[PDB]
Structures are given as structure tokens and as C-alpha cells.
């Protein structure tokens, strides 16, 4: 049977391929992650059907009901077999689902404009004229919400007392807020790298706040975890992953 | 509750003999980044352990003819150790015989060589033969070149393979020495080069990273510790401890 693969829209990992003619099925999709899934499928010999995550979320745990959502939720309830997307490997997520070894490594950092006085996270945390935030219900938000490091603690208190204002639905939404207002955006460095190759106005600020990877997500105990790990290491070793990265970051 | 058996290998600054005027015994003989990591893990997961240096002094590679493994990987396969806590690279071939925790450090193959030369990549090395070059025998680095379809890298393996017993060394320590005393460039892992170049201001990493990979804790395939150690490592990383460990030992 075909594998149900849940994913999410996120340039340049996953996007609607553009064409003069209507497109159908998996062929509607292109991107780094789309190329990766193809590769994985030819090495492992499986067929698959790509489905965008219904609630359009990556996956976080609700404070009250303690229930999950997004792509994470869909693996837990076995609605999908694989989650192929820029899905960050995190502590809280490993406790409910499995991940393959990372196909890409990265970290949280700051998207802002060039030539400003702001040069680190600490600079953002010690002022308030410059508003800042991040994708809601994402690994980045969760990092701050759970952090016990002073600066990040403070930054979360600020973001938390302004959920409606500074938190955004999507990366795209955040990027636009940076481009159109006086706003700094806490986001993942690989995605930042794509934004700055195309927005000469913008730049990463400071270094990486943490380190993490994107892995293929599976329901806990799935046979495909180990298998996809092996396929990913092959692709990496033979230089294909680096070629894919180059292709989609230009 | 039986302690775990932890296989490891000597490699600065991941693992080393603690310097002492008085003879040390058992676990007390060892210190380093990996030793620290091992202490963190044992507190989080609540286990005790016995440290054992892999007897053959090898990381682990498979023989072409017989299909048999050596080193720390052999120790895990044979179930002679419960964990491998070392700068052990997560690779395709190893992953088929053992399990790995999610990585505690990511890095890549690059080049260790002297300053003040016009050579800026592996392609520079690959086309000449005056400047000799090699890597650690039966390690993930030698294996990378041995298996690569990339023209430049295939060429470099032809060179290394033909000069096996004079350009391949038993350890990073050996390689570091050859670079320092001869016209020799050493293919090694970037994390280790970073340690070397800080200690030795006349050396430098030539070019960027030739590939990407991570170190992970090794377990026998199917071990229940794989998942738990993955979670512990992700904990240590997220709370900032792994970064502190790196600065502590890379000063
Ligand atoms: N890729 C992230 C979402 C983006 C972010 O949180 O910055 C995740 O897995 O949740
Ligand atoms: N750390 C390497 C050995 C050193 C090298 O090959 O450069 C390994 O896991 O095999
Ligand atoms: Cl794992």
C-alpha cells in the first residue's frame, strides 16, 4: 500500500509547483523536502501520497488539555505514516514520536535588518521599542517557553504578554512583518539563510542560539524510522543532500 | 542492577588519561568531553558503568573479504559492551549493524595543513603528489574516500590506498605529528582540527567541510538505551550543557 506522508507549506522545503497546466497528486509539490521524499522512496521502494497537514501546524502540546496538534498530532494518531518537512527534532517531541537521524542541521537565530544597533539576543531582551516574536506552536516558541536561561526567559515573558501581537501564524507572515515594520523575527537559521539570499536588506543577527536537526517523523515504534535513517545517511554520504540544498538555496 | 559496560577509545580532548602523580584505578583514570557526557547521561538515566578502552584501539570498519568488523563497533555487535561513548561517527555502513543515539556533535571531514601555501582545497591535493596526504586507518574518514564516486575523492583514495603503510596512520595523534614534521596534509574531522589549530598556531584547516556527519552514542542494534540516550542528549543540548562541555574541553 501507499504511505500517507504529511507535510507543510514552507519555502523552499515544500511549495506548490507552478505550471501552465493544472497539476495533480504528488506532482503538485516541489522543493528540497519533496526531492528528499522522492529519493527516499526510490531507495526504500515505497509508494506515497502527499497530504498537507490539516490544521497547518508543526506540532505543540496544549497547556491545559495536554493534547498535541499539527503534523506531530497526525503521527501520534497514526493518521500519517511519515512526516516529511522542516520538522525539528526536539526533546518534547521525541517523547511521543520517533525521528530519523537529521537530514539537515541548524539552529534558532535572529532575522532583522542590516546596520542596526542590535547585535545579539541580549540586545533584544533588554529593550522594547523593537518588537520581536516567532511562529506560534513551533519548536522555536517552545524553546523559549521552556527555557530557564535568563535572557531567553525574559524574551518569553515579553512574547507571552503579547501573544496576540508578536506571535505569528507562519514564517512567511513573520518575514513580512520584518520587511514592513520595525520587527525582529526569531526563526530557524536554514530558513533565514534562504530569506537573506533574496532580501539584501536583511541578515541573521548574532550566532545560533541552539543546535538541532530536521528529521523524518514517524509514529513511535515504526519500522520506517531505522530504514529512513539508513537512506538519509546514504544520500548525505554520496553528496546528494548537499546538491539538493544547493539547488533550492540559490 | 548491573552496571553498563562502556567501550571507548583514547582521543584528545574527548577521552584521555587523567594526569596524576598517584596511580589511578578504574573509571578514575579517564577525563574529557566524552567522560563528562557519560557522567551526565548516567545521572539522567540513573545507571552505573565500567569504562573499557577498546582493546584493538580501533573505531570500527568492516573487512572486504570476510565481512567482519573490528573496534568499538565489533564490541557492540558482539554484545561485549552496552554503550560506545566516544567520538564515533554516525555512518551508513555502521548504522546497518548497530544503533546510534541522535548526535551530540556535528562536524565534517576537512584538511589539516601548514599555513602559508597556495593550496585551498582537496582538488589541489588530488592533482599533485609531492605533498603527501592520508588519514586514520579503518575510520569513517578513510571509509568515506574508499567508497566515494566523486572523481576528486576517488583519485585521492587511489593515492592513499597505493601508499597505505606510509600515509595511513593508527591515530589522529600520529597524523598530527606527520603534518608537523613533513610535507604532509592530514584528512581529519573538523571538530578535532578546531582543537589542533587552537593549540598550534602554525596550522590551519584548508578548504571547508568535505562532508557532514555527527558523533552519536553507540548501542547494539535493538538496545532500549538508544531512545533514552537520544532523549537525554536532546535534553542536555536544549538546556545549553553540550555547548558548555565543548567550550570546557576546547578552551
Ligand atoms: N520547523 C519548526 C517551525 C518553525 C519555528 O518554530 O521556527 C518546527 O518544527 O516546529
Ligand atoms: N572518529 C572517526 C575516526 C577518525 C577519522 O576517521 O577521521 C570514526 O568514528 O571513525
Ligand atoms: Cl532515536
From Swiss-Prot, chain A:
PTM remark: Sumoylation mediates kainate receptor-mediated endocytosis and regulates synaptic transmission. Sumoylation is enhanced by PIAS3 and desumoylated by SENP1.
Query: What do we know about how this protein assembles, alone or with others?
Result: Homotetramer and heterotetramer with GRIK5. Tetramers may be formed by the dimerization of dimers. Assembles into a kainate-gated homomeric channel that does not bind AMPA. Can form functional heteromeric receptors with GRIK4 and GRIK5. Can form functional heteromeric receptors with GRIK3. Interacts with DLG4. Interacts with NETO2. Interacts (via C-terminus) with KLHL17 (via kelch repeats); the interaction targets GRIK2 for degradation via ubiquitin-proteasome pathway.
Q: Which family does it belong to?
A: Belongs to the glutamate-gated ion channel (TC 1.A.10.1) family. GRIK2 subfamily.
Q: Which residues bind L-glutamate?
A: 86, 88, 93, 139-140, 188
- Extracellular-side segments: 117-250
Q: What's the stated role of this polypeptide? A: Ionotropic glutamate receptor that functions as a cation-permeable ligand-gated ion channel, gated by L-glutamate and the glutamatergic agonist kainic acid. L-glutamate acts as an excitatory neurotransmitter at many synapses in the central nervous system. Binding of the excitatory neurotransmitter L-glutamate induces a conformation change, leading to the opening of the cation channel, and thereby converts the chemical signal to an electrical impulse. The receptor then desensitizes rapidly and enters a transient inactive state, characterized by the presence of bound agonist.
**Which organism was this protein described from?**
Rattus norvegicus
Q: Add the further remark from the entry.
A: The postsynaptic actions of Glu are mediated by a variety of receptors that are named according to their selective agonists. This receptor binds domoate > kainate > quisqualate > glutamate. It does not bind AMPA without coexpression with GRIK5.
Q: Where in the cell is it found?
A: Cell membrane; Postsynaptic cell membrane
Question: What is the tissue specificity?
Answer: Highest expression is found in the olfactory lobe, piriform cortex, dentate gyrus, hippocampus, granular cell layer of the cerebellum, and in caudate-putamen.
Top-rank taxon, per record: Eukaryota
Q: Which residues are glycosylated?
A: 201
Spell out the protein name for this chain.
Answer: Glutamate receptor ionotropic, kainate 2
Amino acid at each position: 500500500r501507499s504511505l500517507i506522508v504529511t507535510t507543510i507549506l514552507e519555502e523552499p522545503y515544500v511549495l506548490f509547483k507552478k505550471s501552465d497546466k493544472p497539476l495533480y497528486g504528488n506532482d503538485r509539490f516541489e522543493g528540497y523536502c519533496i526531492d528528499l521524499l522522492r529519493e527516499l522512496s526510490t531507495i526504500l521502494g515505497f509508494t506515497y501520497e502527499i497530504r498537507l497537514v490539516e490544521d497547518g501546524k508543526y506540532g505543540a502540546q496544549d497547556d491545559v488539555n495536554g493534547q498535541w496538534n499539527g503534523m506531530v498530532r497526525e503521527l501520534i494518531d497514526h493518521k500519517a505514516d511519515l512526516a516529511v518537512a522542516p520538522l525539528a527534532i526536539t526533546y518534547v517531541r521525541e517523547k511521543v514520536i520517533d525521528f530519523s537521524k537529521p537530514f539537515m542541521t541548524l539552529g534558532i537565530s535572529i532575522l532583522y535588518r542590516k546596520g542596526t544597533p542590535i547585535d545579539s539576543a541580549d540586545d533584544l531582551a533588554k529593550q522594547t521599542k523593537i518588537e520581536y516574536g516567532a511562529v506560534e506552536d513551533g519548536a522555536t516558541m517552545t524553546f523559549f517557553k521552556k527555557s530557564k536561561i535568563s535572557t531567553y526567559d525574559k524574551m518569553w515573558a515579553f512574547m507571552s504578554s503579547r501573544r496576540q501581537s508578536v506571535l505569528v501564524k507562519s514564517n512567511e507572515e513573520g518575514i513580512q512583518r520584518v520587511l514592513t515594520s520595525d520587527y525582529a523575527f526569531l526563526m530557524e537559521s536554514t530558513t533565514i539563510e534562504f530569506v537573506t539570499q533574496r532580501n539584501c536588506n536583511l541578515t541573521q543577527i548574532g550566532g545560533l542560539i541552539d543546535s538541532k536537526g530536521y528529521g523524518v517523523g514517524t509514529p513511535m515504534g515504526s519500522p520506517y524510522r531505522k530504514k529512513i535513517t539508513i537512506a538519509i545517511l546514504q544520500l548525505q554520504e554520496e553528496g546528494k543532500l548537499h546538491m539538493m540544498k544547493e539547488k533550492w538555496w540559490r
